[PDB]
Symmetry: C4
Subunit: 25 residues, 4 copies
Amino acid sequence: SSDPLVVAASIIGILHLILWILDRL
Amino acid sequence: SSDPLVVAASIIGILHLILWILDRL
Amino acid sequence: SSDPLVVAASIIGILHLILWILDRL
Amino acid sequence: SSDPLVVAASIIGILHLILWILDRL
Ligand SMILES: [Ca+2]
Ligand SMILES: [Ca+2]
Ligand SMILES: [Ca+2]
Ligand SMILES: [Ca+2]
Ligand SMILES: [Ca+2]
Ligand SMILES: [Cl-]
């Protein structure tokens, strides 16, 4: 388990990557 | 809970994203 | 130990960096 | 505490930011 802050940051980070890929495609 | 180093890095990461968005807007 | 979500995000983050470096080189 | 993998990724992430800032400056 992790700090809820870290879990939040991890989710935001992944979604940021996915949005960037979809934008490029 | 997480390592204080990881908590620190998560905070820096989020603030980096927010500053980038505000700069673009 | 960390949340499996955070572990996943950390792996994705590193691989993203490695791919970017290899692309530049 | 966090997974050693996550600790590693956090350190790499911060150093990446610092190097980028120093490069820009
Ligand atoms: Ca933990
Ligand atoms: Ca806490
Ligand atoms: Ca420690
Ligand atoms: Ca969980
Ligand atoms: Ca482990
Ligand atoms: Cl963690």
